[PDB]
């Protein structure tokens, strides 16, 4: 997909969510 | 208050910012230190991109939290 920027943004989104699992 | 900025490449950096101070202020400091335009750089946290016009208090960001860096791709 010609949207490396968008995928990158969500990629980081998921990574962060994993860490903040305990609502923090 | 202090928070670590993590670059997509892989680099965390200490960054002190008042809770009351909005994101715009944070970007300003980041620009002076790292040397990157606020609009270009985009922070992500809690599955939500930080807006350049909202106080940290509302976000309720944890102390010394890591923020994901994301540079907007050039239109060209």
From Swiss-Prot, chain A:
Compartment(s) where it occurs, according to its Swiss-Prot or TrEMBL record: Endosome membrane
The UIM domain, residue ranges: 4-23
Gene source species: Saccharomyces cerevisiae (strain ATCC 204508 / S288c) (Baker's yeast)
Family label: Belongs to the VPS27 family.
Subunit structure, as described in the record: Component of the ESCRT-0 complex composed of HSE1 and VPS27. Interacts with ENT3 and ENT5, the ESCRT-I subunits VPS23 and VPS28 and with the COPIb subunits SEC27, SEC28 and SEC33. May form a complex composed of VPS27, HSE1 and DOA1. Interacts with DOA1. Interacts with ubiquitin.
Biological role: Component of the ESCRT-0 complex which is the sorting receptor for ubiquitinated cargo proteins at the multivesicular body (MVB) and recruits ESCRT-I to the MVB outer membrane. Controls exit from the prevacuolar compartment (PVC) in both the forward direction to the vacuole and the return to the Golgi. Allows VPS10 to return to the (trans-Golgi network) TGN from the PVC. Might also function as an alternate adapter in the COPIb clathrin-like coat.
Protein name as it appears in the record: Vacuolar protein sorting-associated protein 27
Residues of the full protein shown: 255 to 278 of 622
Note: Present with 172 molecules/cell in log phase SD medium.
The record's note on its domains: The FYVE domain is involved in the binding to phosphatidylinositol 3-phosphate (PtdIns(3)P) which is required for the association to endosomal membranes. Both IUM domains are necessary for efficient binding to ubiquitin.
Coiled coil region boundaries: none
UniProt superkingdom: Eukaryota
Curated annotation (Swiss-Prot), chain B:
Subcellular location(s) of the protein: Cytoplasm; Nucleus
Taxonomy, superkingdom: Eukaryota
Span of domain Ubiquitin-like: 1-76
Effect of residue 63 to R: Deficiency in ubiquitin-protein conjugate formation. Loss of DNA repair function
Transmembrane segments: none
Cross-link Glycyl lysine isopeptide (Gly-Lys) (interchain with K-? in acceptor proteins): where in chain: 76
Function in brief: Exists either covalently attached to another protein, or free (unanchored). When covalently bound, it is conjugated to target proteins via an isopeptide bond either as a monomer (monoubiquitin), a polymer linked via different Lys residues of the ubiquitin (polyubiquitin chains) or a linear polymer linked via the initiator Met of the ubiquitin (linear polyubiquitin chains).
Protein name: Ubiquitin
Lineage: Eukaryota, Fungi, Dikarya, Ascomycota, Saccharomycotina
From-to range in the entire protein, with total length: 1 to 76 of 128
């Amino acid at each position: 997909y010609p949207e490396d920027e968008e995928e990158l943004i969500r990629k980081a989104i998921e990574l962060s969510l994993k860490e903040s699992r305990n609502s923090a | 208050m202090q928070i670590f900025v993590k670059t997509l490449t892989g680099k965390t950096i200490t960054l002190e910012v008042e809770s009351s101070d909005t994101i715009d202020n944070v970007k300003s400091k980041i620009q002076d230190k790292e040397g990157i335009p606020p609009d270009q750089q985009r922070l992500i946290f809690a599955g939500k991109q930080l807006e350049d016009g909202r106080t940290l208090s509302d976000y309720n960001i944890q102390k010394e939290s890591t923020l994901h860096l994301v540079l907007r791709l050039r239109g060209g």
